[PDB]
mmCIF file of C-alpha atoms and ligand atoms in Angstrom:
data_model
loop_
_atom_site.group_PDB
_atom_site.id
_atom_site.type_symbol
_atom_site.label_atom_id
_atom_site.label_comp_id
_atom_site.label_asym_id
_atom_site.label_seq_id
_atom_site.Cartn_x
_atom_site.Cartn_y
_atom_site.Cartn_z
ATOM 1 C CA UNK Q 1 0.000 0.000 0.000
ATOM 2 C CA UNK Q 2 3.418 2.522 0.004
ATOM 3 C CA UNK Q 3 3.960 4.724 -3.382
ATOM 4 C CA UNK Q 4 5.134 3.285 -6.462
ATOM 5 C CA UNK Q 5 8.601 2.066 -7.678
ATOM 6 C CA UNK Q 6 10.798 0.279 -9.814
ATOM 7 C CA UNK Q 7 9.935 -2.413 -7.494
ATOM 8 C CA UNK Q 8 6.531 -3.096 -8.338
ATOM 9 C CA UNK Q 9 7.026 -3.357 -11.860
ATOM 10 C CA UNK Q 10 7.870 -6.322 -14.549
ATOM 11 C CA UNK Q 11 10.228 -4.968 -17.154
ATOM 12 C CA UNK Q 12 8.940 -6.300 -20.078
ATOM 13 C CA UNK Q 13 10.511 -4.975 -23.242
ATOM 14 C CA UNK Q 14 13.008 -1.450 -24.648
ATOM 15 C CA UNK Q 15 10.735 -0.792 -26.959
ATOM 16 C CA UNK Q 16 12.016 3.026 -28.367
ATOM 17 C CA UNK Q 17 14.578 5.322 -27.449
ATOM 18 C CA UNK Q 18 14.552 9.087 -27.877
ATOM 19 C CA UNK Q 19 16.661 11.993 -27.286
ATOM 20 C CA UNK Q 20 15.824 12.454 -23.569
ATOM 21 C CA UNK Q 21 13.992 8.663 -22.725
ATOM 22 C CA UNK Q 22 14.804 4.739 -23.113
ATOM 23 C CA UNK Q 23 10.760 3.799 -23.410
ATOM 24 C CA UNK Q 24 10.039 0.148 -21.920
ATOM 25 C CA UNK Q 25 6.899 -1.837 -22.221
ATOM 26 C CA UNK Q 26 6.587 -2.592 -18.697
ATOM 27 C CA UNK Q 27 3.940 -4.920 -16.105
ATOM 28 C CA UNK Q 28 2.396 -2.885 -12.888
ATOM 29 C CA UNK Q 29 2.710 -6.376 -11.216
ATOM 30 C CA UNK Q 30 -0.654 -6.217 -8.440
ATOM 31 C CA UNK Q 31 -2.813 -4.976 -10.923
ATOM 32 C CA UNK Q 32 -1.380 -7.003 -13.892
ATOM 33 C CA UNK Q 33 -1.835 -4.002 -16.306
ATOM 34 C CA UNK Q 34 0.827 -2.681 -18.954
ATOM 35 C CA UNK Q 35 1.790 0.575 -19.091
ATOM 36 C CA UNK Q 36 4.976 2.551 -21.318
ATOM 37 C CA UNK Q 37 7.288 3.572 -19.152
ATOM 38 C CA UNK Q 38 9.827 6.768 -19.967
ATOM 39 C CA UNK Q 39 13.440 6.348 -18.240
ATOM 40 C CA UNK Q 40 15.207 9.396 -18.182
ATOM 41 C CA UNK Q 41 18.488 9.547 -16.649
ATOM 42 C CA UNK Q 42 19.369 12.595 -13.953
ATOM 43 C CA UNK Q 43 22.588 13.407 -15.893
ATOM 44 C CA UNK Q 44 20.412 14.530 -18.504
ATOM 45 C CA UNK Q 45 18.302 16.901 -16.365
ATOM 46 C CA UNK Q 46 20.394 18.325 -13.409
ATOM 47 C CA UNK Q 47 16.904 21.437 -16.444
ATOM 48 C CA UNK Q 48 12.639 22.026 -16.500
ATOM 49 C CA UNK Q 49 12.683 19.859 -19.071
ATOM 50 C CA UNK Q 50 11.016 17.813 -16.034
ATOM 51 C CA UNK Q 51 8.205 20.197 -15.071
ATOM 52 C CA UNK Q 52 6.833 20.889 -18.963
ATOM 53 C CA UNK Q 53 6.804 16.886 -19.052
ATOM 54 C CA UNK Q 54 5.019 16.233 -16.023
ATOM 55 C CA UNK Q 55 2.324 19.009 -16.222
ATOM 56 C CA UNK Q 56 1.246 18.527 -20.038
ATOM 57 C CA UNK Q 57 1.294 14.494 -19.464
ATOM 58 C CA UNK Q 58 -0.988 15.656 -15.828
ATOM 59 C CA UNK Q 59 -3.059 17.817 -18.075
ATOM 60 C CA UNK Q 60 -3.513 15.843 -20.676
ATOM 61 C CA UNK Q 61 -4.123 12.553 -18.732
ATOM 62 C CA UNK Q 62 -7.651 10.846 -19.586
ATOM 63 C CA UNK Q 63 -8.243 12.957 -22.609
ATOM 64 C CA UNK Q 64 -8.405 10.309 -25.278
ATOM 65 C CA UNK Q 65 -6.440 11.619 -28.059
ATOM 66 C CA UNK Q 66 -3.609 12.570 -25.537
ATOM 67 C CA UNK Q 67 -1.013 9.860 -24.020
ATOM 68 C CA UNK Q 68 -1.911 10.162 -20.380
ATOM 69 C CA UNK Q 69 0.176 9.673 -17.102
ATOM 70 C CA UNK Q 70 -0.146 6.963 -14.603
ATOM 71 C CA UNK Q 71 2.463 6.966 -12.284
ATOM 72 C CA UNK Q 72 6.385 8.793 -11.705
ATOM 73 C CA UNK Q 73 9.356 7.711 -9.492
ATOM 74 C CA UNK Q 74 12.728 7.992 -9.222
ATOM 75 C CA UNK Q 75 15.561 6.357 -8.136
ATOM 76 C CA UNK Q 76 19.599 7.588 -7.500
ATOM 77 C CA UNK Q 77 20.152 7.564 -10.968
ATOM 78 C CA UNK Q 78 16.899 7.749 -13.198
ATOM 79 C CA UNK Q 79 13.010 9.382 -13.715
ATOM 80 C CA UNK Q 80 10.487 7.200 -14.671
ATOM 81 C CA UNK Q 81 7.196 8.183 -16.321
ATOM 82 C CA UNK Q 82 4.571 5.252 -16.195
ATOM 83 C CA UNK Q 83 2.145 6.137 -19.071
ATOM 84 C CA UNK Q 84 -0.522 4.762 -21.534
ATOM 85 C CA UNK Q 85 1.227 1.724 -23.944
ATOM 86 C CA UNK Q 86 0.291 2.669 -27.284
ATOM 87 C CA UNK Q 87 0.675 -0.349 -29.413
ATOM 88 C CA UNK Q 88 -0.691 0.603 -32.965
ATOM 89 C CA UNK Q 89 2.444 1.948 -34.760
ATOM 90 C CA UNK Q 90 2.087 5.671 -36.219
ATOM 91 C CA UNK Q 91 0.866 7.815 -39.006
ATOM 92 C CA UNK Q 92 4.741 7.850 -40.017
ATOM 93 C CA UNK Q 93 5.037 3.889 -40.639
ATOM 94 C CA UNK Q 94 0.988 4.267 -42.020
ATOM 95 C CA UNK Q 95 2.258 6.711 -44.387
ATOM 96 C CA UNK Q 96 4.696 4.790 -45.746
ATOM 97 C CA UNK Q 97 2.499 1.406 -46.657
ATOM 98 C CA UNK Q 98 -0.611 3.312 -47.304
ATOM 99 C CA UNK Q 99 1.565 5.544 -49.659
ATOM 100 C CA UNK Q 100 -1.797 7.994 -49.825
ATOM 101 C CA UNK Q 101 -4.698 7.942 -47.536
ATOM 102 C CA UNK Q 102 -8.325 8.507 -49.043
ATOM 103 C CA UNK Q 103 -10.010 11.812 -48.375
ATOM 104 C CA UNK Q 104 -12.522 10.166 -45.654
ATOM 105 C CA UNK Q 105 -9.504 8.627 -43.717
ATOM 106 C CA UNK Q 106 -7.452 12.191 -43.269
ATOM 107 C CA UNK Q 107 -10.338 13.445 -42.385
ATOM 108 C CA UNK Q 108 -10.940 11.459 -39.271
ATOM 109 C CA UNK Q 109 -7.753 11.163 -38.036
ATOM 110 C CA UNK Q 110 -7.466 15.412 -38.416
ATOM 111 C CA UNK Q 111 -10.576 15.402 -36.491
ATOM 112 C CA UNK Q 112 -8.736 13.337 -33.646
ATOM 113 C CA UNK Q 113 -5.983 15.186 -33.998
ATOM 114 C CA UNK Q 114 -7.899 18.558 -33.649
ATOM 115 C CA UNK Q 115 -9.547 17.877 -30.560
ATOM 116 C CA UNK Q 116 -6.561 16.742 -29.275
ATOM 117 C CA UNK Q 117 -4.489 20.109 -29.766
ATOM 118 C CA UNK Q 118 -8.062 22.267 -29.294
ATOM 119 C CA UNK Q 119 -7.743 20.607 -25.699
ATOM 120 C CA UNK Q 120 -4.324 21.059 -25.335
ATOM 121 C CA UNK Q 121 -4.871 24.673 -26.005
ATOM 122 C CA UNK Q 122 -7.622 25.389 -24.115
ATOM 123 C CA UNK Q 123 -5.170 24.333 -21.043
ATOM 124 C CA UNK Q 124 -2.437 27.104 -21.946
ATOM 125 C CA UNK Q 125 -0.409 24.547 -24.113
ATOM 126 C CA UNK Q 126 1.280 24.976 -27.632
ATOM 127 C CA UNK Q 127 2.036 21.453 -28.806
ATOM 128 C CA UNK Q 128 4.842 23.116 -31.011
ATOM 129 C CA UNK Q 129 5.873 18.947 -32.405
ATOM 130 C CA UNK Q 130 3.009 17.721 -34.146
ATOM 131 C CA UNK Q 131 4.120 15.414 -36.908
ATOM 132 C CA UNK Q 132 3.760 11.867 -38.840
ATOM 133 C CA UNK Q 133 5.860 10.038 -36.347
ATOM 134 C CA UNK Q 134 4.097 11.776 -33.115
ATOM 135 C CA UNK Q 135 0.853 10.639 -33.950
ATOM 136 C CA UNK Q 136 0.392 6.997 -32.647
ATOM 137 C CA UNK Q 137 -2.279 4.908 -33.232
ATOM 138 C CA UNK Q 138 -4.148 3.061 -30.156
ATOM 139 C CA UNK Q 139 -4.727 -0.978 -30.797
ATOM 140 C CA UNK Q 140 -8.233 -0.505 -32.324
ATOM 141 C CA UNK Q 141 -6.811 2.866 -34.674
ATOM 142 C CA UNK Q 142 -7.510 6.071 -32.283
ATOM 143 C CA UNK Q 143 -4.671 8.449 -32.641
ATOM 144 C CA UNK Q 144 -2.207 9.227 -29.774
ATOM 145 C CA UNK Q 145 -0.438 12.528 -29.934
ATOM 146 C CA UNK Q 146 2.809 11.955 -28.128
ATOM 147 C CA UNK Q 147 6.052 13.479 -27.136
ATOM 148 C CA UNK Q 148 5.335 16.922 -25.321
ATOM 149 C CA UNK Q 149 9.264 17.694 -24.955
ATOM 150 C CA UNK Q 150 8.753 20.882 -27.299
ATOM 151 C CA UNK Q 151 5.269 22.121 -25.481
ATOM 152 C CA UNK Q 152 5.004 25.221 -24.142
ATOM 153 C CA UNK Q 153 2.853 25.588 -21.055
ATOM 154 C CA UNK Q 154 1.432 28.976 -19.828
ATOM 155 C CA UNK Q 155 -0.326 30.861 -22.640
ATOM 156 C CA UNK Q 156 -3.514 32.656 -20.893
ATOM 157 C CA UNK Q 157 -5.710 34.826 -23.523
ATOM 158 C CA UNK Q 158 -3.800 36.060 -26.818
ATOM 159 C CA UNK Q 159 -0.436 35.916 -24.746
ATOM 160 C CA UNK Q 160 2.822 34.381 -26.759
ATOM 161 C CA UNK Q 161 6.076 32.904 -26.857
ATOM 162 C CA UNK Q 162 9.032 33.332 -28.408
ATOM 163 C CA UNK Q 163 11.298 29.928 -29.333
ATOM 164 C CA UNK Q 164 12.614 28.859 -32.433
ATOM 165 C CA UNK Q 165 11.722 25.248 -32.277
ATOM 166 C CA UNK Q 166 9.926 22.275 -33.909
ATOM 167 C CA UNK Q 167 10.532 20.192 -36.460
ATOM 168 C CA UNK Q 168 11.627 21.701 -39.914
ATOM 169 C CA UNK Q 169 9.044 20.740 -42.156
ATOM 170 C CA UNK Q 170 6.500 21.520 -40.356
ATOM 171 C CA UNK Q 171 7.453 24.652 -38.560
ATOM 172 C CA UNK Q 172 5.207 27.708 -38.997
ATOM 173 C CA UNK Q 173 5.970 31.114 -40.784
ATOM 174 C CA UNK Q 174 5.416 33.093 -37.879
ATOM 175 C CA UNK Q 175 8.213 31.559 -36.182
ATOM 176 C CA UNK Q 176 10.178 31.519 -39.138
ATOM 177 C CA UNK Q 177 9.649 35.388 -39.126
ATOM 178 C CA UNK Q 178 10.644 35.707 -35.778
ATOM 179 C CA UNK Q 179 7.714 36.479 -34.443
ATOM 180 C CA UNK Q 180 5.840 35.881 -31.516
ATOM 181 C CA UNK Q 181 3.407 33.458 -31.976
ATOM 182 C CA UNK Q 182 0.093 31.598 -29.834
ATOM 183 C CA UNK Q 183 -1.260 28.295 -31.013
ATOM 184 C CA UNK Q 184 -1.866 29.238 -34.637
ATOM 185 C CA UNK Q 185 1.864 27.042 -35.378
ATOM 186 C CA UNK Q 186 -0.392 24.023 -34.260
ATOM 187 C CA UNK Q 187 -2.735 24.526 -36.982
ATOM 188 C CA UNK Q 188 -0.347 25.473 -39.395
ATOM 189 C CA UNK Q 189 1.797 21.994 -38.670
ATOM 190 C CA UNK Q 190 -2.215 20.415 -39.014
ATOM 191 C CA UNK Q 191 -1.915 21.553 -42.100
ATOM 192 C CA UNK Q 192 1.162 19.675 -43.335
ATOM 193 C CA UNK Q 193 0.570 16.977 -41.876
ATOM 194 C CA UNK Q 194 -3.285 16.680 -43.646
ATOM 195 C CA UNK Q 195 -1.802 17.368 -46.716
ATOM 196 C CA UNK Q 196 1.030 14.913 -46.242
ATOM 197 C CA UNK Q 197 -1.892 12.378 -45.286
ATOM 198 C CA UNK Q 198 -3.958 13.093 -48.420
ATOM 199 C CA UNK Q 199 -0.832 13.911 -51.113
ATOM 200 C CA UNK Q 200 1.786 11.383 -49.450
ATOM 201 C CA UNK Q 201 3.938 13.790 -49.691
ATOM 202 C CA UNK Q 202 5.470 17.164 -47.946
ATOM 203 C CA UNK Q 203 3.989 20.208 -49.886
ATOM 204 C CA UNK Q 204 7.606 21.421 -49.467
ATOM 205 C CA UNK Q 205 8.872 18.545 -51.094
ATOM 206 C CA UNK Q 206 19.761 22.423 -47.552
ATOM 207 C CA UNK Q 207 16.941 23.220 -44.386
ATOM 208 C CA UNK Q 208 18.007 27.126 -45.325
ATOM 209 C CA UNK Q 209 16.666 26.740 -48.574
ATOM 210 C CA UNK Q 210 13.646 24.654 -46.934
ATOM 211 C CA UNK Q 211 12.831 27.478 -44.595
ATOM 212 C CA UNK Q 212 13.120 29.882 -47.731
ATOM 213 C CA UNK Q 213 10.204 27.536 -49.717
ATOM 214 C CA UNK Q 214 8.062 27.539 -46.514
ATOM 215 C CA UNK Q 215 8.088 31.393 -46.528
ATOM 216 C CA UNK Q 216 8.070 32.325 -49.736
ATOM 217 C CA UNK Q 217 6.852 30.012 -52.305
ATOM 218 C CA UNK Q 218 2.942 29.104 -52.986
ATOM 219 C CA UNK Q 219 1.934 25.898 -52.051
ATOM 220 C CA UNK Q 220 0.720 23.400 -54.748
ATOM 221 C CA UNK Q 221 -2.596 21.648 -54.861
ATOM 222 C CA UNK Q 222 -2.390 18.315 -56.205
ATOM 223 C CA UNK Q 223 -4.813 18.295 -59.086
ATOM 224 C CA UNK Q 224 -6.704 15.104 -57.854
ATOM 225 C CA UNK Q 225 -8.070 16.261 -54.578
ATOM 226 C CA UNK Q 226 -11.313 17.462 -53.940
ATOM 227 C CA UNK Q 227 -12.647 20.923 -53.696
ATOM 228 C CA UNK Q 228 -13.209 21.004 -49.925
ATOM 229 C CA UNK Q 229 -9.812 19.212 -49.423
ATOM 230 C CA UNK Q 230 -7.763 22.213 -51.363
ATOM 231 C CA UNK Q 231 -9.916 24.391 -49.279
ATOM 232 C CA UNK Q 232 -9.045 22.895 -45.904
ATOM 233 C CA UNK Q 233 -5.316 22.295 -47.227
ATOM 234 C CA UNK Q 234 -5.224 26.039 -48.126
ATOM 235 C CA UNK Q 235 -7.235 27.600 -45.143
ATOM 236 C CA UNK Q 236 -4.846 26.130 -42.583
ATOM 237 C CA UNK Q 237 -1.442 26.627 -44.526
ATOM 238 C CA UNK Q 238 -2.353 30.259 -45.079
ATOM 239 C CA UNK Q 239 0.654 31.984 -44.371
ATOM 240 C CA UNK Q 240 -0.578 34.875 -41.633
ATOM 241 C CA UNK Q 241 -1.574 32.959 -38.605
ATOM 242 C CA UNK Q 242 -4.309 36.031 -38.423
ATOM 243 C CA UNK Q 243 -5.823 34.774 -41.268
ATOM 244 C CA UNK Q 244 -5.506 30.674 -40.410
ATOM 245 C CA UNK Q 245 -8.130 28.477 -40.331
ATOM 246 C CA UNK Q 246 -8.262 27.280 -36.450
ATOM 247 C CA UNK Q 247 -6.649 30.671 -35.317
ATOM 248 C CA UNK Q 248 -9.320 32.881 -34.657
ATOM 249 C CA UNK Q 249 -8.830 34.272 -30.983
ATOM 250 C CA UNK Q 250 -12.444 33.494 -29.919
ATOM 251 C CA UNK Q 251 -14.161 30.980 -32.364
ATOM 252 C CA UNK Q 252 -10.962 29.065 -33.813
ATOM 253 C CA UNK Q 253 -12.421 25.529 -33.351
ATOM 254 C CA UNK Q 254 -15.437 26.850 -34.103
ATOM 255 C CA UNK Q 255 -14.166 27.180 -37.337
ATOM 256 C CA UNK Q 256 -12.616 23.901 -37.824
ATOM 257 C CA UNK Q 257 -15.823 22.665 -36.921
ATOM 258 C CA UNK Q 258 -17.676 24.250 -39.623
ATOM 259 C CA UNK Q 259 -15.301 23.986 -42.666
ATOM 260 C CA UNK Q 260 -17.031 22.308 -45.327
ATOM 261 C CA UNK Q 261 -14.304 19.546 -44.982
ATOM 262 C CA UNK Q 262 -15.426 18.621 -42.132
ATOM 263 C CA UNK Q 263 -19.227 18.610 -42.036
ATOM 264 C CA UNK Q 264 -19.434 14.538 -41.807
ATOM 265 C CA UNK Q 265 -18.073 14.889 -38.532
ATOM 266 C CA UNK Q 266 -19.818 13.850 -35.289
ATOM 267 C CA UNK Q 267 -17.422 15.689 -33.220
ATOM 268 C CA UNK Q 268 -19.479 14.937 -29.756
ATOM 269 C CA UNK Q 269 -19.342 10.828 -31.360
ATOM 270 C CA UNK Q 270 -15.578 11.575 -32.200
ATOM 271 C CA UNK Q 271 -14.798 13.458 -28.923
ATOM 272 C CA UNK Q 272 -16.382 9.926 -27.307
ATOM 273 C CA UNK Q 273 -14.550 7.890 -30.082
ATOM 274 C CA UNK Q 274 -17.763 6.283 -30.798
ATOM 275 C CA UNK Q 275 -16.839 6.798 -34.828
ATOM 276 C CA UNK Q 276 -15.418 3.463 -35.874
ATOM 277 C CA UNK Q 277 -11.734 4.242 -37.280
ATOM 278 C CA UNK Q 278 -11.338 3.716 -41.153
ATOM 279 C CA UNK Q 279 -8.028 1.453 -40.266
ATOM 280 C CA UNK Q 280 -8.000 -1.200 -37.547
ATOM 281 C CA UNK Q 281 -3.638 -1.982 -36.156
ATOM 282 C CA UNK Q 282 -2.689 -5.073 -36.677
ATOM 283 C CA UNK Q 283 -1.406 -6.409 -33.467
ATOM 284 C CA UNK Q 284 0.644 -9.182 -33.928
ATOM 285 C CA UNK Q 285 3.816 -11.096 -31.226
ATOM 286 C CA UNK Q 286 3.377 -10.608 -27.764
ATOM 287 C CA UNK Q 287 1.802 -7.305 -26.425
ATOM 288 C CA UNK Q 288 1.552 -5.969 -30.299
ATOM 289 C CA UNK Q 289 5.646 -5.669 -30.304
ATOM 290 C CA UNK Q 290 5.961 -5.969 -33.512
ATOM 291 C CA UNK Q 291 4.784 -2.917 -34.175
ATOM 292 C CA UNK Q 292 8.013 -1.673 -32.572
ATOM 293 C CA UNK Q 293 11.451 -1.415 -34.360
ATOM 294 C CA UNK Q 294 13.770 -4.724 -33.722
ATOM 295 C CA UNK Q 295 16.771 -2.650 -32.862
ATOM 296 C CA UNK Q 296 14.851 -2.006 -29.642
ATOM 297 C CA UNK Q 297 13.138 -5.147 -29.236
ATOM 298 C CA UNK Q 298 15.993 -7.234 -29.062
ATOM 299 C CA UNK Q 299 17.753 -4.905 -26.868
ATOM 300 C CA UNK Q 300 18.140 -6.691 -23.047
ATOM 301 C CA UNK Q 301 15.436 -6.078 -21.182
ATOM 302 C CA UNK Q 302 17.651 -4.098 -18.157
ATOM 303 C CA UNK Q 303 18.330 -0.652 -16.918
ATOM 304 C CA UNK Q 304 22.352 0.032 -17.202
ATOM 305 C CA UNK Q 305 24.267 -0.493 -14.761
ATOM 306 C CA UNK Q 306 25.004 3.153 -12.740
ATOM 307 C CA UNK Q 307 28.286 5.051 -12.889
ATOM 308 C CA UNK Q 308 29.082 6.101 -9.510
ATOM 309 C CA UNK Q 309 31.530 8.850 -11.010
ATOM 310 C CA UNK Q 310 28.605 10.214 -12.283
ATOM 311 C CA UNK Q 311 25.686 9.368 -9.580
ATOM 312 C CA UNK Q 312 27.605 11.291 -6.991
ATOM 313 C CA UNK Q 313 27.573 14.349 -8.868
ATOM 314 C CA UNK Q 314 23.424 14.687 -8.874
ATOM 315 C CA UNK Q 315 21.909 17.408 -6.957
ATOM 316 C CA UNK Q 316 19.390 15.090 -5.466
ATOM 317 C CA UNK Q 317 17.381 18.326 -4.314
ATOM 318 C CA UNK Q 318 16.707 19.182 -8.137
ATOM 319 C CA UNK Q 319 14.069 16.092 -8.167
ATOM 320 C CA UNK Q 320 12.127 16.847 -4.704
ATOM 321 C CA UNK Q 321 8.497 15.949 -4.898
ATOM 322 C CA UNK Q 322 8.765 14.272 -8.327
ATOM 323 C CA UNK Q 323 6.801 11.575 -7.483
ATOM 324 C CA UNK Q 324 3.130 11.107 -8.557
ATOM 325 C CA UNK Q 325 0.529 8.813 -8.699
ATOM 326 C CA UNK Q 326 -3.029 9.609 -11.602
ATOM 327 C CA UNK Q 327 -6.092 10.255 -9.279
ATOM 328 C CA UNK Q 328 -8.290 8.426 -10.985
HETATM 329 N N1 ATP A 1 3.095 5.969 -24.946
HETATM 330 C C1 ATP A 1 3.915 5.224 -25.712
HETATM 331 N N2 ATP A 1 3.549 3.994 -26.116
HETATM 332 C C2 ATP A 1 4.324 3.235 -26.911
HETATM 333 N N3 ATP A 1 5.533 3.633 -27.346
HETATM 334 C C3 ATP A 1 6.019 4.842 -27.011
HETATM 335 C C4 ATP A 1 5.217 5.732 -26.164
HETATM 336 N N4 ATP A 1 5.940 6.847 -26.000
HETATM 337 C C5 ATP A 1 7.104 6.695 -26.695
HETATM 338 N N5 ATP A 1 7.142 5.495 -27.296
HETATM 339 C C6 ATP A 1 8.197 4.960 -28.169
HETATM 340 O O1 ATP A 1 9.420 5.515 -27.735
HETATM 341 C C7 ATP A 1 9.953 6.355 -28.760
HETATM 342 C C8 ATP A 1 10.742 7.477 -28.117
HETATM 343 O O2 ATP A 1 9.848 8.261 -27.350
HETATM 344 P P1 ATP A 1 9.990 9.852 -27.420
HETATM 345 O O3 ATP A 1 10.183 10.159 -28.883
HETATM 346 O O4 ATP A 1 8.795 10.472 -26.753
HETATM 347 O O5 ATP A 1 11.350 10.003 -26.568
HETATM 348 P P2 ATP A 1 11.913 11.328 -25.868
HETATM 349 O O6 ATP A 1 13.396 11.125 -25.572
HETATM 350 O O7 ATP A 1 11.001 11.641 -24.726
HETATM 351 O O8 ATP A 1 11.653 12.591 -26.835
HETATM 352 P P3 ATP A 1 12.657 13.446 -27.780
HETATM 353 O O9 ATP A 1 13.449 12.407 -28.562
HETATM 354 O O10 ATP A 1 11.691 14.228 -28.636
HETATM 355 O O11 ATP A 1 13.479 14.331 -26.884
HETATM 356 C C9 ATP A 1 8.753 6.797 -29.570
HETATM 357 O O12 ATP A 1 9.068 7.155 -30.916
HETATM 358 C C10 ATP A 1 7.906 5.548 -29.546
HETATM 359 O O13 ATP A 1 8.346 4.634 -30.567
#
């Protein structure tokens, strides 16, 4: 009945590795569930890196489009965030088989993915990292956004910030400028990522020259999409965030809402995830790991050994108070 630790858990599989985390599949043993869990070693971190994480995965948490946060520890070395296993692959690897995805299709998962950041930013977040390999899929095909290392977390009525940041092709004019800029790079990133979905490929097609396309070159329609598809493609890659479908300060998902592209929608069904997705994962070896790259999955299923040169050298006070269990 004491508060969670590496001690009441199964290691079950490495299963990705980022920048910041080693990601395990992992067994809460006296509740036999599976969770993710995110291992981030101290060295990294001894900056708020760690708050950003913890409040967007606490404020997301039990949304369904969001990846939500069971459980953190730590021990000497390491953080560990216990969060929702999402076993479906991702839009990225989808992209790549499906080559193209049918009008209907982007259109669902852009509704998922619209509530999603609509939430987000109705909590004072800027995703600021949506992208083809951020969007997971759940087992039965709900999307997953994922990866809030780039969020910023404090935005209260117009209100900005000011980082260069994101990933190149999908990064926003406004920061490109040099501006300061609200949540109107989410919807620009929506965007490219819709019309990646639907053209199966970047509408931008060295990353000096890139950033020189994104500002000043019109973007091509590809002739074979439908009239409300160009419209959505072009009402959300305007160039002046002012002007951006999504970015108007009082009725922005409104807006979304109401494009033409979207009037199928049962956004209160959606919202519920009562719409049946247009793609059902494939889950196949154990726990769906195949859906996982090998390099990972054959790694040993172990934390590495600590370095004492380097343990001793942790401000332990940095991590006070880290721990948390969901109240659900
Ligand atoms: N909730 C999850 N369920 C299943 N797999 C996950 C989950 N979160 C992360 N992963 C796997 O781990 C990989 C690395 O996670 P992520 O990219 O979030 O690492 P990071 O170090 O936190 O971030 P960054 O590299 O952006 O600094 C992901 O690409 C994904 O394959």
């Amino acid at each position: 009945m004491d508060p969670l630790g590496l001690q009441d858990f199964d290691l079950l599989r490495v299963i990705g590795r980022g920048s910041y985390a080693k990601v395990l599949l992992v067994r809460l043993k006296k509740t036999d569930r599976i969770y993710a869990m995110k291992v981030v070693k101290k060295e990294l971190v001894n900056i708020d890196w760690v708050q950003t994480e913890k409040h967007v995965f606490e404020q997301a948490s039990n949304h369904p489009f969001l990846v939500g946060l069971h459980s953190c520890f730590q021990t000497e070395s390491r953080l560990f965030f216990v969060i929702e296993y999402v076993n479906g692959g991702d839009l990225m690897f989808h992209m790549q088989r499906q080559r193209k995805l049918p009008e209907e299709h982007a259109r669902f998962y852009s509704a998922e993915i619209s509530l999603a950041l609509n939430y987000l930013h109705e909590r004072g977040i800027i995703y600021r990292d949506l992208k083809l390999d951020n969007v997971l899929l759940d087992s039965e095909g709900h999307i997953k956004l994922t990866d809030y290392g780039m969020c910023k977390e404090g935005l209260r009525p117009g209100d900005t910030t000011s980082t260069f940041c994101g990933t190149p092709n999908y990064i926003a004019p406004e920061i490109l400028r040099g501006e300061d800029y609200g949540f109107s790079v989410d919807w620009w990133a929506l965007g490219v990522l819709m019309f990646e979905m639907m053209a199966g490929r970047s509408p931008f097609d060295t990353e000096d020259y890139l950033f020189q396309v994104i500002l000043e070159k019109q973007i091509r329609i590809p002739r074979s999409l439908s009239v409300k598809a160009a419209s959505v493609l072009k009402s959300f890659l305007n160039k002046d965030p002012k002007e951006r479908l999504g970015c108007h300060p009082q009725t922005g998902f409104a807006d979304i809402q109401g494009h033409p592209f979207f009037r199928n929608v049962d956004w209160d069904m959606m919202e519920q995830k009562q719409v049946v997705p247009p793609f059902k994962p494939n889950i196949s070896g154990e726990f769906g790991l195949d859906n996982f790259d090998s390099q990972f999955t054959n790694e040993p299923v172990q934390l590495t050994p600590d370095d004492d040169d380097i343990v001793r050298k942790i401000d332990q006070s940095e991590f006070e108070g880290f721990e948390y269990i969901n109240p659900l």
